[PDB]
Design a protein around this ligand. Sequence first.
Ligand code: FAD
Length: 439
Amino acid sequence: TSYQCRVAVVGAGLGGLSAAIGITLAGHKVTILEQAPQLGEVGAGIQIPPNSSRILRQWGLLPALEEVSVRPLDSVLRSYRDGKVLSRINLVPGYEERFGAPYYHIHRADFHRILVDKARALGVEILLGKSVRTIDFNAPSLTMADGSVYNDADVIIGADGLKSVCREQMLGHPDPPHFTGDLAYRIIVKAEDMKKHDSLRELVEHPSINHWMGPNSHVVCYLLKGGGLYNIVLACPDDLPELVNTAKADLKEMRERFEGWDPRLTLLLSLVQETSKWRLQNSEEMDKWSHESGKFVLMGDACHATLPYLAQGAAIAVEDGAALGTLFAHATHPSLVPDVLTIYEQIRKSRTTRVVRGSTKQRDIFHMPDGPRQRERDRQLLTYADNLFEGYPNQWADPVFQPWLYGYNAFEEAEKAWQKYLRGHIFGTTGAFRELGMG
Ligand SMILES: Cc1cc2nc3c(=O)[nH]c(=O)nc-3n(C[C@H](O)[C@H](O)[C@H](O)COP(=O)(O)OP(=O)(O)OC[C@H]3O[C@@H](n4cnc5c(N)ncnc54)[C@H](O)[C@@H]3O)c2cc1C
C-alpha cells in the first residue's frame, strides 16, 4: 500500500494537463478543476520546440502529434520593408540532430485534445464547471462560485493561467495582469489561394517560421496542417481605442499597419478567411510560487507569464509539469511533499526567469525602429551569421542561449536537484528526508 497524494490541479490548460500527466505517471491521483463548462477546442497555432517535444515523446505522444503537426524547415528573421532575409536558422534536420527532438507547429486545439486524451487514459478526473474563488491553504480546500467546497485533496497546484485566482488568493491581495500596451491581429489564409500568386509560393513549398521585424511591430507567419491554413499574427501598438472588431475593421486596420511592409504581407490581407483582434497582456514575475503551509504551488503563466516573442510559454509549462511529476515520483512519504514543492520552484524559477528575460530581449530586437540602431542590428545579423557570438541579435541563434533553451531536459534537472536535496544541499527545505532515513 504505497503513498498516494491527492493532488488537485486548478485549470485544464496545457500546463495543468502536463502536471496531471507527470504526477499520475508518478503514482498519485490527480483531479483537474477547470472553470469553462467544456474543454477548449479553441485557439490558433502553437510551437512545440525540442525541450517540450522530448518530454511529450517520453509520454508516448509523438505519433498522435505528428499526425496533426508540421515540421518547419527553418526559422527566418526578415526586414519589414523588403522581406529581406537577415537571419536563417536550420531546424530540419538541424534541431533533431543537435537536441534530439522534433520542433512542431500544431494547432492549439489539437495539442490540447491530445493532452486531455492522454490524461483521461491515465485516469485523471476532470471536473468542469468548477470556478474557484477562495482557497484555504492549510486544510486544503477549494471553494467554488456556486458555494460548493472541494476538500478531497492533499495538495493544490495552481494552473489557472494569466487571470489566476490562485495567485491572488495565495498573495492575499488582488493582482490583475499588466497590459503590454500592444495588440495582436490573427489572420488565417488558405494555402491553396497562396499557391495561386507567384510571390507567395515559396512560403508554401518551403514551410518555415517567417518573422518580419519592424518599427514597434512584428509579423509571424507559419503553416498548420488543418485546412492547409496559414497563420499570420501581427503584433503592433494599440495607439487606437475603438476595439471595433468586425471582419472589415481589421482589413482596413491591418492594411494601414502594413503601410510600407513587404508587399507580400499586404497581398495576404486580400486572401483572408478569418480575422481576430485582441489586446495583449501578461504578469510580472513572482518571488514566491509556494505558500508557507507547504500545500500549494503555482505553475505556468500564473507564476512565470512570458512575452510571446520566444515561443516558449507552453514549452516551459510542459517543463513545469514534467518537473512536478519527476519530483512527486520521489514523494513516497507525505512529509516529503512540501520539500518537493520547494525543490521545484527553485529549479523552475531559475529557468523560467531566464526565459522571461530572453523574450523581453527578443522584443527589443524585433521592435527596433528604423535608424542607426536598426542599421547596426541588421549589420550584425548578416555579418556574423557564420561566426556567431554571445549577444547575437537573434536569441534563437545565440550560441549560448540556444543550446541552453533547447537542450534542457526537465527530467534530468529535477533528478539532479533531488540528489542535491538528499545530500542536504537545497536551501529552504524542512529536511523531511532526514527523519525518513534517506541520506
Ligand atoms: C499570442 C500568443 C502566442 C503564443 N505562442 C506560443 C508558441 O508558439 N509556443 C509556446 O510554447 N507558447 C506559446 N504561447 C504561450 C502559451 O499560449 C501559454 O504559455 C499556455 O497557455 C500556458 O498554459 P497554462 O496551463 O500555463 O495556462 P492556460 O493555458 O491559460 O490555462 C488556464 C486555464 O485555467 C482556467 N482558469 C482560469 N481561471 C480559473 C479559475 N479561477 N478557476 C478555474 N480554472 C480557471 C482557464 O479557463 C484555462 O482553461 C503563446 C501565447 C500567446 C498569447
